[PDB]
Write a protein that binds this ligand. Structure first.
Ligand SMILES: Cc1ncc(C[n+]2csc(CCOP(=O)(O)OP(=O)(O)O)c2C)c(N)n1
Ligand SMILES: Cc1ncc(C[n+]2csc(CCOP(=O)(O)OP(=O)(O)O)c2C)c(N)n1
Ligand SMILES: [Ca+2]
Ligand SMILES: [Mg+2]
Ligand SMILES: [Mg+2]
Lengths: 839, 837
């Protein structure tokens, strides 16, 4: 009934919502943060006399039901306006808001750490500073992307790993960028400092990568036992590694049966400028609770040194007060903490991990710090941030402030802190591992033409097909789906040749029949964009689903196909991380059309095509890219085959253009059964899914094999052949039908199904019979500046007899991939067919 | 008075969470989880309290005191009806009170005059009639029907009417396939007969009908307004940054400093806006200086399905697809699309909010998709219950007509007259937009002559002004050193470096009154410490920009340190350059290796917009490029990819090698009357190379050379081999040939690789009548660079008796090696191989 008691409650609520806006977060003290009137008691009409009266605390979780207002006011400022700026009241979940209030408000901001723990934090701050000054002394001017100014991340990361083992987690996977990367390698993951000193000195499998992109694996002793540690390889492109780490841990969580993600912990580290500006951050946040990509939530740490290279003005880097405001899209709590207060850092770190393990949701730690040097060690920061570095020049390091605090508290002494600095310098001189909790951990690279088991028992293959066509009798299907499954029933009885959708389905069935995993993701991949797959049967009565590939037999390998979020960059990065972590199974990503894969171009350029040469990473990821010129316009015709062929080199990737249902069946099986794990780029057909001539028999599947090149199929006279037409994909069936309708027999048509690595022997074998050949033609639907022409012509010339010429037949070069009009498309298609067939 | 505190907390609970119980789904399939805070029993309010009067606090219903039973009814009408208001997450108290006054005073029930209700019904009739008409006349054809979201047509026209009502001059729209033909015919005023011709089959290679843009004038109560609908590709959401660049280009030209004259509108799909990362990149630019346009009205056509995907657990991680907007604290108005008056009422609020606070605002139009994703697709295979409900769901026109008839605000004959009269207008084939009004070459070939010369005395006066700065504006000593060098360059005591000639090139354009807009990461100083367009005071943090201080009549100059984004920023500058081609619009990647993050803008806009949409764009892209031993991501701008994209004169690919060449190259992009994209391989070490210098006369009296002939005085008859090359590899070849005292080898630069300058190249090669072979030298791996794409051009230029040979790095999966020592060995090998006869 008291009115001021209600005013006290609104004062508490105002600090929970907005206390972070006045918190002393900047270590440099340069921030002049705008005043918030609600934090002032006078805003709530509380006077000096009210401060002496006792009040009930309401839901304020300080640990006593009643206390005087002067003590309530002191409690709020210490809880929410000290070194910790807690941002959590935007969340809608009441239980989670109560959970955070119990952690912070009972502590009243002041964490209690053991003298052993306080010494470990100081020793870890000593390791962070000492390694960085050591590298600056020994290699002056060399780029190292120093952690200095953000030294608290080293105790934070080791406290995160220790708390992860303390909570029974088995593995931790980390994605990070350049900032503090060498510090994380030496002082957390346990890389030998002498090995790091060798890399600065010029001592080095493949073409390699820069020192601050390297990953690492190690075991790490924790109170709860040894934990495996993994630090990802990444390119210079920022933030893209985050989805890749999400895929790796999900592949780990799948293998371990960790359905709630409590055994494998994902940690991503971000820069303040990068996390605000890169769109892949939002795409990954949008996948955090998708059933096909969720990993139980990620702990996300921003090393917020308040500058991006030469850009520090908030009006240039972002549109909001905090770089972490993107996290609000998924209502993640955000803990801003001053980096000069390591105990607040470790205290916020335990809370953020406990929140992640409790509610299985993303959580963000904003480590507000500074950059002691320029963006790199050879760059001048004063030219563009004069005031910031005039303050940094007179700012003591976090180790020195923390040691001074412990000494004034008589929780440490000056000689112990001095011993840490000098002893760590000697340990770097010794060159051995300086991580006391480090522990030792307790191929698939064969050439593409390695022999593999292509055959399958034909009766088992029919038995698998009969099981694929079965579904519960109460699970009513839509009539168009019942029709397609009836066609699939006729294919299993030999009454019809198999179409693309059936041969693709049997390929998955044989792999789960062998216990191999299959994970498919992509937009509308459950049904298929072109209505050909229908891996998921939707009941017409309720909305229940049934997946025949998940019901082959007990003890089968797992099968999953996910309708992916409407994203390409983060999703393709996720599946690359999944396939690299678990190469044994099939991992396939399907673009809706191949034209849209260029939105994930960074994953294609910096991971898929180059990860083996740069990091010795094998990845067997399969990419289905629908492709084909059928008159549907520039964005529904070309998967940009020319770009993938341009990326091919040093056996890095496979580029394949299957033309038969049997070819895609063996192609898929070869990607698992053959002991090689390199990316498989596939030009998926569209009209060929229903082309009457694009069919295969059960004998082609059971006893056939993937053909890198397909010889002439029609009854020709080898001596009468005047021209051989090379081609790939659906253009073959256009050439084949026109050549038959012309009753032509002086023209041979040979398909090159695998465009890279180039199958020279198979191509020469297909061309041997025509001893009277005069010229060779490469026919393609693509414009002359696209497709295989400019990139693969040298391979075609090396295969043909020396006396013959190679000629081009195809669409003219064009700036746009395809014409906007169907009528123009059909006339262009007929011209390239007639030109290829015209002796 | 304890219940009085409970009543205030009940009011606050509806402001925060009333949207979670609102009747938003037209189909009523949503079983929304119960919210305990909305229950009065949760606040310990019983039946006895409901009869007692209470003070409403800040509840803006128009009376300070009310019985609890009326307050409870008022809250449900305000926050749990057709409108789900999400605004309490905002921190700004003035903006929260502003929204509360709009919604709570109305108590949910907007008041429209009988004329306005008739306009909404007629516009719903136009939306439905055109879509059923196209289905009857072209069955099965892809049209991406608006049906189920018909309220967007009255919403857009009310947005434009309200925009002119508040004095705005221009509105620019970016949207996707959904309702695109409806927007063209029923809002932008495209002739229905012209649309019917395109369904029946018919400047360039063209594009599909639902990518077309349009321009028109639009009568509003406040006067005529210009309307623009953007061209866009199939790639979703990418058009949004492009529209942001167009409106900023309009606001810059008009002096619309606060963005109140030009209104940007973006339309989104529910699945696309949640999943595409360019959305967040654009929201992060909404208040950054150099990209802000005063806020955008953003409309989501939320039909609760994406193609075959409707399960929320597969499309997003949150209850709402619009939750991304919370990163910038935008209010979000969810509205049932079957309630057009709630739609129009929310529409006026969102525009009034945008004009008042100059911030982004989102309208979540909760609707359904009447047909499959396209008209030839079966939705029931994957969404059975949703379409079993849609099959028995009346259309929005029918529901609104019934409502007006039950209110006696309309009659069945008027609603029937609208349906049949609109069908007759489509048969007539003329414009059906009653407020439509009529509106009140940069493609010449690349070799067109242009004014390359400049007064040398004028150029020296420009350079001396560039070196001036206030004497109190203390500079960092390294910046004072570089500016002292530029002073000596203006006095003729030193040859020009890359940074000075680039700066003088900008100086001549603003000197002629042309605009210059530069954006890119760290572009003010330059990533490589060469530009320093912005001088930062060492005492305070104040800035000074010499290029903005040439003279009082100069054209505007701006260089912005861009956000850490490539996709949205390059899409923004493409929209800026296309909207205002007169000036220079330049985007600088930090390294060219990072431009692949904006590959969609490169593939679908820059390289193809002319052939597809007849749009000219003179955007310049500085992409730092060069093999200097810094690793795979700091060596290659992927020149081979840009050359692969070249065709039909679409783009210019240039690799300047001298400070004079970049000066003329820059000037040519404005002075020459052509506006096609300029792809530039920017140097890095050449910014400080002692041999990479030019004189003031090279700027004043020189010109851009597509090819540069041999510069050393050689005997033409002694040359046994010609080495073609581009970029910094030339300076490596030149020094090695000089150290060898070699004179049988000529080194010719091909500065412009596309369009290929055959005549300039052949002129450089004519003197060497005794040549035996030609070499293409490149630092790039053989599968990269110009080799595979440009070799046919090299063969066509050389005499028939000679062979073309390759000298360069071996093909590699990664652009460059990790180690500097391996890099120097590879560099020495390709240099020695190119020069070794
Ligand atoms: C996608 C991408 N664009 C540009 C760059 C170039 N780049 C490297 S670091 C950097 C600044 C990063 O700023 P911040 O996120 O604050 O990281 P910090 O160095 O300050 O720790 C930029 C623009 C890059 N590496 N990746
Ligand atoms: C970047 C990109 N990825 C994929 C596609 C293919 N695609 C076209 S429409 C579509 C579904 C769009 O869903 P939504 O955003 O809800 O739009 P709607 O059709 O429902 O109006 C997809 C995935 C595309 N056009 N662009
Ligand atoms: Ca992107
Ligand atoms: Mg930073
Ligand atoms: Mg949709």
């Amino acid at each position: 009934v008291d009115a001021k008691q209600v005013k006290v409650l609104q004062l508490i609520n105002a600090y929970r919502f907005r206390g972070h806006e006045a918190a002393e977060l900047d270590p440099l003290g340069l921030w002049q943060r705008p005043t918030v009137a609600e934090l002032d008691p006078a805003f709530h009409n509380l006077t000096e006399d009210d401060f002496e009266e006792t009040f009930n605390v309401g839901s304020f979780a300080v640990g006593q039901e009643t206390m005087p207002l002067k003590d309530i006011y002191t409690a709020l400022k210490k809880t929410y306006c000290g070194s910790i700026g807690a941002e959590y009241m935007h969340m809608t979940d009441t239980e989670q808001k109560r959970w955070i209030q119990q952690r912070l408000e009972s502590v009243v901001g002041q964490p209690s750490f053991d003298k052993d723990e306080k010494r470990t934090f100081l020793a870890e701050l000593t390791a962070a500073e000492g390694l960085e000054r050591y590298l600056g002394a020994k290699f002056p001017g060399a780029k190292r992307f120093s952690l200095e100014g953000g030294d608290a991340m080293i105790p934070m990361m080791k406290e995160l790993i220790r708390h992860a083992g303390r909570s029974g987690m088995r593995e931790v996977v980390i994605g990070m960028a350049h900032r503090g990367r060498l510090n994380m390698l030496v002082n957390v993951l346990g890389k030998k400092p002498q090995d790091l000193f060798d890399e600065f000195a010029g001592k080095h499998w493949g073409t390699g990568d820069v020192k601050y992109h390297q990953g690492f694996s190690a075991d790490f002793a924790t109170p709860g036992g040894d934990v495996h540690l993994a630090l990802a390889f990444n390119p210079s492109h920022l933030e893209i590694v985050n989805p890749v780490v999400m895929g790796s841990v999900r592949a780990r969580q799948d293998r371990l049966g960790d359905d709630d993600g409590s055994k494998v912990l994902p940690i991503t580290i971000h820069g303040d400028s990068a996390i605000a500006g890169q769109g892949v951050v939002a795409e990954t946040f949008n996948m955090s609770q998708a059933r096909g990509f969720c990993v139980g939530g990620t702990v996300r740490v921003v090393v917020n040194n308040q500058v991006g290279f030469t850009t520090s003005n908030p009006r240039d880097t972002r549109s909001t007060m905090y770089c972490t405001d993107i996290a609000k899209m998924v209502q993640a709590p955000i803990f801003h903490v001053n980096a000069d207060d390591p105990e607040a850092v470790a205290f916020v770190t335990r809370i953020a991990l406990d929140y992640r393990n409790e509610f299985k949701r993303d959580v963000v730690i904003d480590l507000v710090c500074y950059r002691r040097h320029g963006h790199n060690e050879a760059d001048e920061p004063n030219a563009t941030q004069p005031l910031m570095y005039q303050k940094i020049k007179k700012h003591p390091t976090p180790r020195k402030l923390y040691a001074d605090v412990l000494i004034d508290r008589n929780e440490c002494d000056i000689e112990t802190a001095t011993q840490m600095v000098n002893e760590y310098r000697d340990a770097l001189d010794h060159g051995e591992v300086v991580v006391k909790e480090w522990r030792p951990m307790a191929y698939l690279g064969h050439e593409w033409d390695t022999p593999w088991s292509n055959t399958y028992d034909k009766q088992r293959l029919v038995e698998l097909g009969k099981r694929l066509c079965q579904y519960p009798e109460s699970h009513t299907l839509h009539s168009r789906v019942s029709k397609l499954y009836n066609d699939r029933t006729a294919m299993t009885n030999g009454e019809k040749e198999l179409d693309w959708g059936m041969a693709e389905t049997l390929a998955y069935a044989t792999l789960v029949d062998d216990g191999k995993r299959i994970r498919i993701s992509g937009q509308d991949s459950g049904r298929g964009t072109f209505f050909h797959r229908h891996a998921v049967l939707h009941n017409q009565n309720d909305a229940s689903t049934y997946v025949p590939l998940a019901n082959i037999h007990d003890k089968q390998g797992p099968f999953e196909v996910f309708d992916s979020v409407l994203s390409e960059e983060a999703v393709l990065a996720f599946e690359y991380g999944y396939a690299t972590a678990e190469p044994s199974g099939l991992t396939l990503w399907e673009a809706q059309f191949g034209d849209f894969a260029n939105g994930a171009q960074v994953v294609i350029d910096q991971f898929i095509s180059s990860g083996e040469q740069k990091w010795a990473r094998l990845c067997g990821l399969t990419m289905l890219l629908p492709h084909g010129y059928e008159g549907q316009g520039p964005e529904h015709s070309s998967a940009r085959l020319e770009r993938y062929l341009q990326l091919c080199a040093e056996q890095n990737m496979q580029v394949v253009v299957p033309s038969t249902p049997a070819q895609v069946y063996h192609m898929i099986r070869r990607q698992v059964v053959r002991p090689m794990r390199r990316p498989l780029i596939v030009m998926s057909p569209k009209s060929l899914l229903r082309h009457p001539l694009c069919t295969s028999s059960l004998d082609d599947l059971a006893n056939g094999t993937f053909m890198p090149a397909i010889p002439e199929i029609d009854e020709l006279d080898p001596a009468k052949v005047k021209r051989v037409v090379f081609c790939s994909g659906k253009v073959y069936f256009d050439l084949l039908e026109q050549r038959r309708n012309n009753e032509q027999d002086d023209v041979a048509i040979v398909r090159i199904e695998q465009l890279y690595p180039f199958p020279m022997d198979d191509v020469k074998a297909a061309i041997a019979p025509y001893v009277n050949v005069e010229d060779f033609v490469w026919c393609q639907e693509e414009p002359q500046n696209q497709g295989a022409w400019y990139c693969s012509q040298h391979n075609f010339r090396a295969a043909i007899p020396a006396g013959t010429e190679l000629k081009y037949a195809g669409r003219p070069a064009s700036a746009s991939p395809a014409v906007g009009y169907m009528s123009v498309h059909l006339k262009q298609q007929k011209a390239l067919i007639d030109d290829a067939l015209n002796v």
